[PDB]
C-alpha cells in the first residue's frame, strides 16, 4: 500500500492521473519523481521548469554542479539527484526531444532508467515541449517499465484521450 490516491489503474504495474505532477509531488512526497529533463539539466520550461520553480531554483542549482563535474547526459540517460522539497529523489530522465530530431527509438532506453527504481511519480516521456505523441508515449511506458509507475498528465484534454485510447 502507498499514498497515491485516485489514480486508473491500467495494467498490473501503470497507473495514471489528471494531475499537476508539482502539486502531487509536493502532497505524496514519494521517493521518486521523475524529471523531463536534457542533457544538460537546463530546466527551463514545460515540467522541468515547473518543477525546478518550485523548489526556488535549488534543483538548477544543485543540476548546474552536476553538469560542471560530469559533463552533459545522453539522451535515454538518467541521474538522480536531490528531490528537494518535492521528493525523496529527483530522476531526471532525458527522453528525446522531436523538436531537435532525436530518434523517437530512444524513447524506450529512456523508459528503462525507470526499471532501477520501485516505485516513481512521472510524466509522460517525450511529451508536451519534447514533441512526441503522448499516446505512443504511453504505449512506450506500458510496454517497458515493470516497476510501480504513477503517470501524472496535466492537461485534462489529454488525459481523457489517452485513457480512451489505450489499448
Ligand atoms: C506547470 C506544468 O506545466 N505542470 C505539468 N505537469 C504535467 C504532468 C504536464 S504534461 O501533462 O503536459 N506532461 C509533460 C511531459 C513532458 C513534457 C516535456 C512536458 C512539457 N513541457 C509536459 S505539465
Same mark, same amino acid.
Request: include cysteine.
Given at each position: 500500500?502507498?499514498?497515491?490516491?485516485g489514480?486508473?489503474?491500467?495494467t498490473?504495474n501503470?497507473?495514471i492521473?489528471?494531475?499537476?505532477?508539482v502539486?502531487?509531488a509536493?502532497?505524496?512526497?514519494?521517493?521518486?519523481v521523475?524529471?523531463?529533463?536534457?542533457?544538460?539539466?537546463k530546466?527551463?520550461?514545460?515540467?522541468a521548469?515547473?518543477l525546478?520553480?518550485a523548489?526556488?531554483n535549488?534543483?538548477?542549482?544543485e543540476?548546474?554542479?552536476?553538469?560542471?563535474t560530469?559533463?552533459?547526459?545522453?539522451?535515454?540517460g538518467?541521474?538522480?539527484?536531490?528531490?528537494?522539497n518535492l521528493?525523496k529523489? *529527483?530522476?531526471?530522465? $532525458?527522453?528525446? !526531444? /522531436?523538436?531537435?530530431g532525436?530518434?523517437?527509438?530512444? =524513447?524506450?532506453?529512456?523508459?528503462?532508467?525507470?526499471?532501477?527504481?520501485?516505485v516513481l511519480?512521472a510524466?509522460?516521456?517525450?511529451?508536451g515541449?519534447?514533441?512526441?505523441?503522448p499516446?505512443h508515449?504511453?504505449?512506450? *511506458?506500458?510496454?517497458? $517499465?515493470?516497476? !510501480? /509507475?504513477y503517470?501524472?498528465?496535466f492537461?485534462?484534454? =489529454?488525459?481523457d484521450?489517452?485513457?480512451s485510447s489505450?489499448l
Open positions: 500500500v502507498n499514498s497515491f490516491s489514480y486508473l489503474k491500467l498490473d501503470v497507473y492521473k489528471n494531475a499537476d505532477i502539486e502531487e509536493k502532497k505524496v512526497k514519494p521517493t521518486v521523475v524529471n523531463a529533463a536534457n542533457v544538460y539539466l530546466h527551463g520550461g514545460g515540467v521548469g515547473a525546478n520553480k523548489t526556488n535549488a534543483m538548477q542549482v543540476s548546474d554542479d552536476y553538469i560542471a560530469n559533463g552533459p547526459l545522453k539522451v535515454g538518467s541521474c538522480v539527484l536531490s528531490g528537494h521528493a529523489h *529527483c530522476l531526471h530522465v $532525458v527522453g528525446p !526531444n /522531436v523538436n531537435k532525436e530518434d523517437i527509438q530512444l =524513447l524506450k532506453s529512456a523508459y528503462e532508467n525507470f526499471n532501477q527504481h520501485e511519480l510524466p509522460l516521456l517525450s511529451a515541449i519534447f514533441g512526441a505523441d499516446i508515449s504511453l504505449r512506450v *511506458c506500458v510496454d517497458t $517499465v515493470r516497476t !510501480n /509507475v503517470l501524472a498528465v492537461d485534462k484534454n =489529454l488525459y484521450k489517452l485513457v489505450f
